Amino acid sequence: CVKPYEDQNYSALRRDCRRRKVLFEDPLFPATDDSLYYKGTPGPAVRWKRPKGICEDPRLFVDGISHDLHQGQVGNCWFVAACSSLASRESLWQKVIPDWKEQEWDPEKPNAYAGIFHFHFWRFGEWVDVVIDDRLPTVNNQLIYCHSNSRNEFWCALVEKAYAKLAGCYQALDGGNTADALVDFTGGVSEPIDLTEGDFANDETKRNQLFERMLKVHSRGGLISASIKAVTAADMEARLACGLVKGHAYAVTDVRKVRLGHGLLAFFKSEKLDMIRLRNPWGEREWNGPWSDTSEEWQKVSKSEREKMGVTVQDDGEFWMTFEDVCRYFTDIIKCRVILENLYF
């Protein structure tokens, strides 16, 4: 059985609260400024509210897991990236969020609810079970850390609160990063690649090397995310000319060699292309360049043929780029190999 974090038994505490008809209040991560800021740091005055008090009909998922994500006024972009990737694959987010339908709110049987949730994380070679109450920071009845576009959706917010419990307090998460978060989420191993320290845009042969590895990781069920390094503070969330955002990271949802049919060779001058599909976790795609759905390249290829090639999308959140452009515009790739042994036990 999965090891309880800090001697907290979810189902025991839950069934207690139900028998007593009270909503769980966590003693080890209380609804107070100590769960928020470092000792003696002055932070914003906050109001901890329960989801009912934020928006009626509260849900873990409104429809499905991958609605837009926002970090908020004081949340961390890297955590949004990490949640986006985690949301990619049912097998993974369903590991961090156990028995999701047992946890989800139910309008019928309302006395199911007990203000309590539990998640799994991978720390020091084992799955720990982190228990929390569902009270969250609020300012103008609005979540100020991570949340989704749908104001009655909470999975991202609660996963965050739990992750912050593991770090000690919210403000600690400013030190984290997408790579380590994916390891804590999947049990795997992370590897970063710095594109501007590797000069992949200016090589091709190593770029092919890198690409083949990514084909390998993704085909094996690993996770990849691509980010643009915001170096200065003035860089944070600056839009590039091609539309991508400095300081954001984009979840790779497909990596693929595509073969183009004869007759396209006239325009493209190649038979095979190294392609990536990414998701913008923050909403509708932004990419302007080749293979944006508004690009000459996209328009030169019939829907019939894109379908045959597999250059499709689930929604306007996704977008295709050639791996040459990926190396031209991104600064880093996180490459988190999944380890299957760690999931099955």
In short:
This protein is of the alpha+beta class and 345 residues long.
Task: Provide key terms for this protein.
monomer; 345 residues; alpha+beta; Cathepsin B, Chain A; six-stranded antiparallel beta sheet; three-stranded mixed beta sheet; 13 helices; EC 3.4.22.-; protease; Calpain-5
Helices, strands, pairings?
Elements: E1 3-4, H1 10-20, H2 51-54, E2 69-70, H3 77-88, H4 90-96, H5 100-103, E3 116-123, E4 126-133, E5 147-148, H6 155-167, H7 178-186, E6 189-194, H8 205-219, E7 223-227, E8 249-259, H9 265-268, E9 272-279, H10 296-299, H11 303-309, E10 318-322, H12 323-329, E11 332-337, H13 340-344
Parallel strand pairs: 1-4
Antiparallel strand pairs: 2-5, 3-4, 6-11, 7-8, 7-11, 8-9, 9-10
Helix pairs in contact: 3-7
Descriptive overview:
This protein is α+β, with helices and mostly antiparallel strands and about 350 residues long. The protein folds into 2 domains: about 1-185, no CATH class; about 190-345, Cathepsin B, Chain A (Alpha-Beta Complex). About 30% of the residues lie in helices and about 20% in strands. The protein has helices at about 10-20, 50-55, 75-90, 90-95, 100-105, 155-165, 180-185, 205-220, 265-270, 295-300, 305-310, 325-330, 340-345; strands spanning about 5, 70, 115-125, 125-135, 145-150, 190-195, 225, 250-260, 270-280, 320, 330-335. It has a 6-stranded antiparallel β-sheet with strand order 6-11-7-8-9-10. It has a 3-stranded mixed β-sheet with strand order 1-4-3. The PDB classes it as hydrolase. The entry lists the keywords peptide binding protein, Calcium binding protein, protease domain, hydrolase. It forms a monomeric assembly.
